Design a protein around this motif. Sequence first.
Motif, PDB file in Angstrom:
ATOM      1  N   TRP A   1      41.434 113.569   4.981  1.00 61.52           N
ATOM      2  CA  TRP A   1      40.180 112.849   4.784  1.00 61.52           C
ATOM      3  C   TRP A   1      40.477 111.368   4.791  1.00 61.52           C
ATOM      4  CZ3 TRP A   1      36.089 116.288   3.720  1.00 61.52           C
ATOM      5  CH2 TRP A   1      36.465 117.557   3.272  1.00 61.52           C
ATOM      6  N   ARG A   2      39.526 110.572   5.264  1.00 63.79           N
ATOM      7  CA  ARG A   2      39.645 109.117   5.175  1.00 63.79           C
ATOM      8  C   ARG A   2      38.467 108.569   4.376  1.00 63.79           C
ATOM      9  NH1 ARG A   2      42.960 106.272   9.005  1.00 63.79           N
ATOM     10  NH2 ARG A   2      43.361 104.169   8.225  1.00 63.79           N
TER      11      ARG A   2
ATOM     12  N   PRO B   1      49.924 106.775  -0.752  1.00 65.65           N
ATOM     13  CA  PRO B   1      50.208 105.660  -1.662  1.00 65.65           C
ATOM     14  C   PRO B   1      49.727 104.315  -1.176  1.00 65.65           C
ATOM     15  CG  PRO B   1      52.235 106.481  -0.713  1.00 65.65           C
ATOM     16  CD  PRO B   1      51.150 107.460  -0.287  1.00 65.65           C
ATOM     17  N   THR B   2      49.500 104.118   0.123  1.00 70.34           N
ATOM     18  CA  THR B   2      49.116 102.802   0.652  1.00 70.34           C
ATOM     19  C   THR B   2      47.950 102.854   1.635  1.00 70.34           C
ATOM     20  OG1 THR B   2      50.979 102.915   2.272  1.00 70.34           O
ATOM     21  CG2 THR B   2      51.339 101.626   0.244  1.00 70.34           C
ATOM     22  N   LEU B   3      47.723 103.959   2.315  1.00 70.11           N
ATOM     23  CA  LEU B   3      46.623 104.130   3.237  1.00 70.11           C
ATOM     24  C   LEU B   3      45.440 104.825   2.562  1.00 70.11           C
ATOM     25  CD1 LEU B   3      48.759 105.442   6.191  1.00 70.11           C
ATOM     26  CD2 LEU B   3      47.729 103.160   6.040  1.00 70.11           C
ATOM     27  N   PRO B   4      44.217 104.604   3.072  1.00 70.07           N
ATOM     28  CA  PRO B   4      42.993 105.127   2.412  1.00 70.07           C
ATOM     29  C   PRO B   4      42.681 106.575   2.797  1.00 70.07           C
ATOM     30  CG  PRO B   4      42.366 103.794   4.268  1.00 70.07           C
ATOM     31  CD  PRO B   4      43.885 103.734   4.221  1.00 70.07           C
ATOM     32  N   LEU B   5      43.668 107.440   2.565  1.00 66.56           N
ATOM     33  CA  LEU B   5      43.637 108.828   2.999  1.00 66.56           C
ATOM     34  C   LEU B   5      43.806 109.779   1.822  1.00 66.56           C
ATOM     35  CD1 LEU B   5      46.070 108.342   6.012  1.00 66.56           C
ATOM     36  CD2 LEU B   5      43.516 108.401   6.118  1.00 66.56           C
ATOM     37  N   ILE B   6      43.269 110.976   1.998  1.00 67.36           N
ATOM     38  CA  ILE B   6      43.316 112.047   0.999  1.00 67.36           C
ATOM     39  C   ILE B   6      43.738 113.324   1.741  1.00 67.36           C
ATOM     40  CG2 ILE B   6      42.021 113.371  -0.735  1.00 67.36           C
ATOM     41  CD1 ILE B   6      39.981 111.223  -0.835  1.00 67.36           C
ATOM     42  N   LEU B   7      44.559 114.156   1.062  1.00 67.83           N
ATOM     43  CA  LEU B   7      44.917 115.466   1.587  1.00 67.83           C
ATOM     44  C   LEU B   7      44.412 116.510   0.621  1.00 67.83           C
ATOM     45  CD1 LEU B   7      48.664 115.361   2.661  1.00 67.83           C
ATOM     46  CD2 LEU B   7      46.723 115.729   4.192  1.00 67.83           C
TER      47      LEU B   7
END
Length: 303
Positions: free
Chosen positions: A211-212, A194-200
């Motif tokens: 993933w970033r 929700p706030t960091l530039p990450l994907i699961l």
Amino acid sequence: MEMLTKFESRSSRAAGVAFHPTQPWILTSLHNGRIQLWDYRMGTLLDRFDGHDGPVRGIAFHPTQPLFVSGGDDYKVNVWNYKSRKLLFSLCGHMDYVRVCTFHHEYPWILSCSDDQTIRIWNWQSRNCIAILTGHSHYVMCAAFHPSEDLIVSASLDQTVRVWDISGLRMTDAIVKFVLEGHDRGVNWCAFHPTLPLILSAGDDRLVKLWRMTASKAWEVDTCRGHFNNVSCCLFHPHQELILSASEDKTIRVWDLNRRTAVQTFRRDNDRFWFITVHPKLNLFAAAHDSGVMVFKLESAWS
């Protein structure tokens, strides 16, 4: 870690759960075609909604409107008003099972994805399909709007995770940005932090991949390894450095966001897990499994 269970519903197999952002409610969508509305603080069934034939895998509340959306193996995307308790209308157009449906947080849009290999974007004010996102070559098992950028992520049994640029539709309307390659079997789920530039992402390879992304590139950070059957669903803890996953191996697993090491496994003896979700604000989680739904908090062991 320990699981403090707040609410459990026993039922036939559940497929989807959705937290209301402000009321102590969950919607549950079941393989028998029915949708339940539960107050998990009192343990009461508030309402039941029957607008589908066959399993209902997609379910979501609008963040501010008195609406929810459901998506079924009958190919329908249904829009409901839970205050008037009416089925307002059906969005028709998908040609195979609907897997996920959600609302956008600002624009008047619904996202749905399907075994027909497409993601559709619908305007719930006009009732029109405003975009069809094509390019996946097998079922699209999940899709999500980014919480603050004009992006969608999707996961497919074609073994890819796609990130789509939808800035054109906000103002060509949808263009694929990234085709993330890494999984060597079908992908079942994808999620944004929700706030960091990450994907699961997670799937039939039993892997959860982190993933970033920046505006211009992405990369695979690391992999959570250990599940011993298909991974159905994965999500970020919004407020702690933790990843959660749920699997047909009958476990929910908690992992360290920074090292991807196992933190805690929770098992059920007889039930596969199909879906997990987290409340946006509260330390509250829900899971759907073969025998119903559970709502729980996560605490440190011996707290």
